Design an enzyme around this catalytic site. Structure first.
Site, PDB file in Angstrom:
ATOM      1  N   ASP A 191       0.895  -1.186   0.000  1.00 52.50           N
ATOM      2  CA  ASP A 191       0.000   0.000   0.000  1.00 52.50           C
ATOM      3  C   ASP A 191       0.925   1.226   0.000  1.00 52.50           C
ATOM      4  O   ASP A 191       2.178   1.057   0.029  1.00 52.50           O
ATOM      5  CB  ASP A 191      -1.042  -0.085   1.122  1.00 52.50           C
ATOM      6  CG  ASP A 191      -2.310   0.747   0.905  1.00 52.50           C
ATOM      7  OD1 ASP A 191      -2.264   1.705   0.092  1.00 52.50           O
ATOM      8  OD2 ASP A 191      -3.336   0.452   1.571  1.00 52.50           O
TER       9      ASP A 191
HETATM   10  O1  LIG Z   1      -4.626   4.687  -4.347  1.00 48.13           O
HETATM   11  C1  LIG Z   1      -3.606   3.797  -3.905  1.00 48.13           C
HETATM   12  C2  LIG Z   1      -3.919   3.049  -2.587  1.00 48.13           C
HETATM   13  N1  LIG Z   1      -3.665   4.018  -1.508  1.00 48.13           N
HETATM   14  C3  LIG Z   1      -4.368   3.935  -0.247  1.00 48.13           C
HETATM   15  C4  LIG Z   1      -5.456   2.894  -0.005  1.00 48.13           C
HETATM   16  O2  LIG Z   1      -5.241   2.382   1.280  1.00 48.13           O
HETATM   17  C5  LIG Z   1      -5.686   1.859  -1.120  1.00 48.13           C
HETATM   18  O3  LIG Z   1      -7.022   1.388  -0.985  1.00 48.13           O
HETATM   19  C6  LIG Z   1      -5.334   2.431  -2.528  1.00 48.13           C
HETATM   20  O4  LIG Z   1      -5.458   1.384  -3.471  1.00 48.13           O
END
Ligand SMILES: OC[C@H]1NC[C@H](O)[C@@H](O)[C@@H]1O
Ligand SMILES: OC[C@H]1NC[C@H](O)[C@@H](O)[C@@H]1O
Ligand SMILES: [Mg+2]
Ligand SMILES: [Mg+2]
Lengths: 733, 733
Positions: free
Chosen positions: B255
């Site tokens: 993430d």
């Molecule tokens: O946008 C990128 C990524 N960043 C943060 C989030 O936690 C996740 O759901 C997302 O896919």
């Protein structure tokens, strides 16, 4: 050993009916009428009694033993939680003393008074860790901290048991509730507990181990599931951990109907299977439901249990009775047969001075605008609120043999203090709740809460008049004791709405407003912190509570209490606790960010943090000094700070030492309490405080449940609360 | 395999710089300006892009690859959560359709639109189990049930990926967030997750396993600790469970900044150590923080990692690109530069009819007093509230490339429906919040919420005048989308106070009150359930939401949505969920008792239970019939019931099948969803519903994670929600 030979010799003469009889723990009541119970004692079918608490009543039970074939004496137990006749503050209030000697004194006096009435055992201490303020039993523990609760757990056991369990001023400690009872999901009593083994071992189990290591004779098993397995059926918990890992040699006691409840938990389809699960898991003694007496003979006959399961349980009960001296003299706590009768409740048998001194130590000053406190003994003082004249509430939940009529109310404490120097004006102001359903709940079993028949508006009109006729208002508000009680979980952590309406109406008088809080749990106090002039947390302060409270309000005692549980800003933040993990995205106060672990619709952090409490004086700490930058394995490190009273009144505060392990094989808390020192200082006086830290203080349970101190940095924090600290670093080699 | 040989052969020609470059996942932003990123692509230093989402922008990135030594194609990813350009209801609303075909359709159209713009991958489905309504990301999941979420997890993966990942109308699914992200303590985003392995294996892990078993090409690793170990550093989670036990063969993606955040979690003192922990735990691809590109060369040179760690991660990225067809044709999703031009946002490229049909299915009628709904198209309708004319809120959080100006508001939907047959009267009534700090938070990054400059009182005065001369009021109220969003955790589950003041003022006009709720999480609606005439839960219904909502309100669609998450009475009850354990002392509704697992200060249980939803018609179920009283190992059981439409309007409902294992080696839930059937019926029409149960439905994880079905009784429940069921028992042999 003489003991094991004495017991082996007795058990050799016993039938299985008699062995099984030793496991039965009952109380007189609807389920067990007195006459049937007396017959069962004579038949050797009763091992112990709870809730029979006077010399003549206990003597009469022990006299029935004489008619039994083997004359095995009863032990008598009770919930002596925070006093027997002389009621000390609730445990949450005792913890706020931050003084092991104050807690030991309350326990020593409790044991003295209980044993003086013929009791051999208390179902105490309650040492469950509590991070959820909604749970009604948080009043019974020492708060959210593993170090403080573990320390006080050991202190309570040692104070109750003394140097000899056969001493007629000692009782056996049954530590409760084993285990994890206070982590109930939703703060709903009896509810599911689900947690990782590292959290269980690091934070929730150590208080029970502290009681076992202090020599507690008994362990009471909890009503909750642990990771899906009721504690009552949990062989891992009661055999593998308690017996084989911890080396506990004493007696396990089921909670009330816990064995039968294995059916509702869905571990058993019938009483016979429930009985088999409890005895084989390692529950020795069966409270109230009589399943052991009903099913153990049929289980044994059928080969569903072993003779060894009955013998283990029976040996444990007889070994408790041996340690309590009851085989030497079953009347050792009951005096001689021609002792004259006495009033059990005579003033001469109370310890009021001790109760007043203990109660002073737990009071926490949360706010004091412009030095309104301490008050002067002059003019007109309005004493307003439903708890001002409450004898039933001041003694709290689990008040044992405490007599409400003997208790000092906040009102009477003020009258005793002012004499003829000031006029006290009383107004009830509000009922403890405006909700008839809550009043009927609180009054469901006995009249616990006086319901004023006036409208809410009429009571407010009287309170506003009283306030307008005074120089200032002491509002005595919060919870009735029945609101912070077994099975009394709250969805709302505020002062009840009827009382908050009263507080808002009193602000319109422009009179200085002192809040005296009575409560058994952390409350949400944002309105009060904004609007009240002063706030004193008094918990439920016991038999002498009103006198101790007046001592603080008029300045005879400089408030020295500090919170042992974080006060949430609202129930919507639960849980809040000081020893939390950082996360990967902690709130940065110097660079605030949306994408951090926080709520957006309310201020973050507790309203009042762990270790918080104010004084009528000011204190300063010198910079923290560590004895070295590096610590060799097996060496001890010294942390030194000088505390100063930089104000005008003598007073005590609590220097708190916290540890952080900032790089580990697990994410470790931002801080963990590892030491403290309560220090009383004159104005201008200084004292050097020395904390010693070793490897033992640096260890934690990793992913694989290794108990290890890993080499690297540790941060040492010292402060007068968990929020306002200075830190220094060292390296473990 | 040609695949293995192709990849081995390419990796044989690659430097470690190029292998490491494959692991870098970046987006254009302040951290990575477009031109710096274009230069890095030319130098072979980029493996993939996220948040570049149009054909011209993606073509321009992929064009840069030609300048690199080995010309390895990029993949492009985005958060296509519930639509790309045509926005479907949020996942929580999609789940309430109880129709895997409706969910598959939204996913198929999302993949079609995303792939049509050049995207190869979505960071979807989000399949985190959610029992805490405070968490802002509840909107992105399918609710509280393991069976439903696991089923829909599989459906989303299969709909996105189609029969071939190289198809230009397919995208790769990156299932998120592995794992347990939605059990955040306090519902605070990013916060600590702590649970037993039996709860983890039984309830929280199966949705991720369902996505792996559906052939998901990628897994996104979560930001949270699991039992003290960040998922990003959790070798047990990513290697032992995901790779060796589950057999996942695809790509793991961190993430955003998850690798660097290992420092804040306190697992690493520096970036080099954080990098080492993530790549050896089994994280292949590094999102945005660039730690892999910075530190992997030094770690390798120093022998702190193996060549095998770099090769494993690189092989996984190249294998994803192979499966997506990008080695065959890197322009397969991008057409050609001489293709006829198009506007990315052309009306002709949307799927409005599909969005309208899908959005009808998730709307949940929670209340309908005296058949007020459906409305007739006549008279005067007051449309009041801050969400009535909101285009930005109807498309919800994670609205991808959705254009607010293309969305149909509730107001416009009612206008479209009534034409000239009725008069619509509008009043804003209130701002979405009365707290300027909450409005500033919501408007922090972009203008998301229109702030009316009038006083609260002026807006109320206008709303009361509008209401006064209408036949009825449609109050369009609830949360803005930024309130139910990543990092937007709430301490209050009510409709915001400014809007509750408006509802109380409207109730006082005596006019029939229809509430159209927009919200991304369960709300506490006690006042609304007591006071409103009708309540329609619309979640955030997407691009055609206003049209679907008007279809239901005027009776063109008979509401058929049912909740997939329990609605608590207040935040003070969190958590509430239908598949809870009984405890030893459950609330008895026939014989209510004080000493039960409950709150005393509020009604108990959820306001609206799992599977609840009304209709404009009534339905009946015949008695439940089981094919036998006993079930042999390996045999299947049939449960039969007849559903009837016993009312006057055509409509759908959902027959739900629940299982209870009332005696087990763990305490098992009171009920667990094991089947359902959504059925559309004409008035007086009947349908026989047949459910099949086998061993697979009866198995559970015991204390030691043995996954088996124990012989004994099972209870089968059938009903139109989790609360109103009939049951029959059988025995497994
Ligand atoms: O946008 C990128 C990524 N960043 C943060 C989030 O936690 C996740 O759901 C997302 O896919
Ligand atoms: O009163 C006996 C026993 N019953 C119930 C309680 O759970 C426990 O704390 C107490 O000791
Ligand atoms: Mg360390
Ligand atoms: Mg079973």
């Amino acid at each position: 050993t003489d003991k094991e030979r004495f017991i082996a010799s007795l058990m050799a003469r016993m039938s299985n009916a008699e062995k099984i009889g030793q496991l039965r723990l009952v109380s007189v009541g609807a389920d067990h009428p007195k006459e049937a119970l007396m017959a069962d004692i004579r038949a050797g079918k009763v091992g112990a009694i709870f809730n029979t608490v006077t010399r003549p009543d206990i003597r009469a039970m022990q006299d029935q033993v004489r008619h039994s074939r083997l004359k095995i004496p009863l032990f008598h137990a009770y919930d002596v939680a925070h006093g027997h006749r002389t009621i000390f503050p609730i445990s949450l209030g005792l913890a706020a003393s931050w003084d092991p000697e104050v807690v030991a004194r309350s326990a020593r006096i409790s044991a003295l008074e209980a044993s003086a009435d013929g009791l051999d055992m208390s179902f105490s201490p309650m040492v469950d860790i509590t991070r959820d303020a909604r749970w009604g039993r948080v009043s019974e523990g020492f708060g959210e901290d593993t170090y403080l609760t573990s320390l006080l757990s050991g202190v309570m056991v040692r104070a109750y048991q003394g140097s000899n369990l056969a001493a007629p001023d000692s009782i056996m400690a049954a530590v409760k509730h084993f285990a994890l009872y206070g982590a109930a999901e939703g703060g709903r009593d009896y509810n599911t507990v689900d947690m990782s083994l590292p959290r269980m071992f690091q934070d929730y189990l150590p208080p029970y181990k502290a009681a076992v290591d202090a020599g507690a004779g008994a362990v009471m098993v909890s009503l909750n599931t642990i990771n899906g397995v009721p504690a009552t059926a949990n062989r891992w918990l009661l055999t593998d951990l308690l017996r084989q890992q911890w080396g506990f040699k004493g007696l396990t006691i089921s909670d009330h109907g816990a064995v039968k409840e294995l059916i509702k938990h869905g571990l058993a389809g019938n009483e016979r299977d429930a009985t088999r699960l409890a005895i084989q898991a390692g529950v020795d003694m069966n409270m109230n439901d009589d399943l052991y007496s009903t099913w153990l003979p049929k289980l044994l006959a059928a080969g569903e249990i072993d003779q060894a399961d009955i013998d283990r349980a029976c040996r444990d009960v007889l070994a408790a009775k041996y340690d309590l001296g009851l085989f030497a003299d079953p009347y050792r706590r009951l005096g001689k047969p021609d002792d004259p009768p006495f009033d059990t409740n005579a003033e001469s048998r109370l310890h009021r001075q001790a109760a007043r001194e203990v109660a002073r130590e737990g009071l926490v000053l949360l706010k004091n605008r412009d030095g309104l406190l301490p008050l002067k003994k002059q003019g007109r003082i309005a004493v307003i609120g439903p708890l001002a004249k409450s004898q039933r509430d001041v003694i709290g939940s689990w008040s044992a043999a405490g007599v409400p009529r003997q208790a000092v109310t906040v009102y009477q404490g003020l009258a005793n203090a002012v004499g003829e120097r000031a006029t006290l004006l009383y107004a009830k102001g509000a009922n403890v709740s405006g909700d008839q359903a809550i009043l009927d709940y609180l009054n469901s079993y006995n009249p616990e809460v006086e319901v004023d028949p006036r409208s809410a508006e009429a009571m407010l009109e009287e309170a506003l008049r009283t306030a307008r006729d005074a120089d200032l208002v002491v509002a005595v508000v919060g919870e009735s004791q029945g609101m912070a009680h077994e099975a009394s979980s709250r969805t709302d952590l505020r002062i009840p709405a009827s009382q908050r309406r009263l507080l808002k109406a009193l602000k319109a008088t422009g009179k200085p407003l002192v809040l005296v809080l009575m409560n058994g749990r952390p409350l949400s106090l944002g309105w009060e912190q904004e609007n009240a002039d002063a706030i004193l947390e008094t918990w439920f302060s016991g038999t002498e509570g009103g006198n101790a409270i007046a001592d603080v309000l008029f300045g005879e005692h400089n408030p020295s209490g500090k919170l042992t549980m974080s006060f949430p800003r609202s129930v919507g933040q639960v849980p809040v606790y000081y020893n939390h993990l950082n996360t990967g995205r902690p709130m940065d106060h110097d660079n605030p960010g949306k994408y951090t672990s926080r709520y957006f619709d309310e201020a973050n952090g507790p309203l009042y943090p762990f270790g918080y409490g104010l004084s009528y004086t000011e204190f300063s700490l010198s910079p923290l000094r560590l004895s070295s930058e590096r610590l060799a394995r097996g060496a001890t490190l010294e942390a030194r700070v000088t505390l100063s009273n930089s104000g005008k009144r003598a007073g005590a505060t609590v220097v708190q030492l916290y540890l952080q392990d900032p790089v580990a094989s697990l994410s470790r808390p931002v801080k963990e309490l590892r030491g403290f020192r309560k220090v009383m200082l004159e104005p201008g006086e200084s004292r050097e405080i020395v904390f010693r830290l070793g490897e033992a203080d640096l260890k934690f349970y990793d992913s694989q449940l290794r108990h290890t101190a890993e080499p690297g940095e540790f941060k040492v924090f010292v402060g007068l609360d968990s929020a306002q600290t200075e830190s220094r670093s060292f390296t473990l080699l």
